[PDB]
């Protein structure tokens, strides 16, 4: 996958006891949730407070996921904050892909790529990526 | 219930789209999880990093829950940080009760009381509240 | 406070698994409310119609948001057995309903809960008294 | 990349409910991996023994931590139907196993996933090659 740019937005996730399975590490089932929380935080930072909730319910733009992939390189535990370095890697006319690197104490625990399309939210109908959103997103896509 | 002291530790919870049900508010099913995350953060702040995970796995003290109760006064949404004001309300010889007030933009959304006993973690056997923990906890119990 | 479960209680099976468990090797307390709520959702499916709260809210336009929950945890929940959630309405007033759920594994009562909801006109997010047609479905299941 | 599901695939039923859904009125993407993992856990219960991963890890001392997952989401998942998770091992090497899960609702394939685990000596959290006794259980279910 693409290496993380210096520019990446970081969303902190506090991992706890209850996120962990009997092997004493974060249950895999929760890791996509953490990544997606980071992407929502990304929208909050660069589009406006309330993340997807604001984007869907106020702006009438949905971004349903069509694909996700993650590689788990090292366990996630409550011993450190999970720093989720998050950035858009591409924006086509129909979809956007975000990268999330989940890092603990400088070790990359997981790397993920998450691809969404765009909808007119209240109609649940696909649309091309709106120009206003393209203007906000493209400055953060690395070379 | 008891009013929140000025002294209460606050743990911030970021509520998102995916925490919300089709009524556009946080699903009730997740609210106890948020409260419990705040209590774990409380242990991190006053006992040491890693919250319950550290307390159980390193200190060999478990704090299993025996009761929880919550009143939901106003909806929780992604529009604001959920500030979870958290404090111990009592510590007997066998159990501790924590209060959590979940507050958004100054409105109290929920009030909860959560009661745990103490175990020798590796034995899953009850014990009285250890003296060292009592010394850390009692300074934060309000009049 | 909490009433004993009647012979008539609806039982919803919940499969508990590895992923529900914490490092103490039992179901994390934070997941237990979810299981109890799933039971209540299944009660609605059984007595009101398939699709539980989703059907109730989106088709019938009746929401039942929670205003209180309380649970006592008596014994650990594990993946060694099905969690049998014995579920019934203990009370229906003019404005609210309270459901009891006992979570039982191999006949051991692991937790006892009481969960109180009010009623809304779903599409308006406005409170309403319990509608008469729902009252008619609910009341026959409230124990003595 | 992702192989079509065989007639032989184990099917695990997942009940999707209100609480799994987001404000767009479909299952939140973040919960879908959980459903797929539950399916894989059920596969282990079916072919290795009751209690899935919990039994595997805590009784048999074999862990199967995940090293990769990928999912394509083709159609929304809702509470209107049971989610039928068609589940099978697509591959077993010396060190890892890959499970496919197709989540199907009313015959529509809502998502297709592939999930890769390695094997550990559970109590040591140390990698090991796939044990021969598990290989013997797994291989008969790997399609052509
Ligand atoms: Cl905008
Ligand atoms: Cl200590």
TrEMBL record, chains A, B:
Write down what this protein is called: Thioesterase superfamily
Its ancestry begins with: Bacteria, Pseudomonadati, Pseudomonadota, Alphaproteobacteria, Rhodobacterales
From TrEMBL, chains C, D:
- Protein name per the record: Thioesterase superfamily
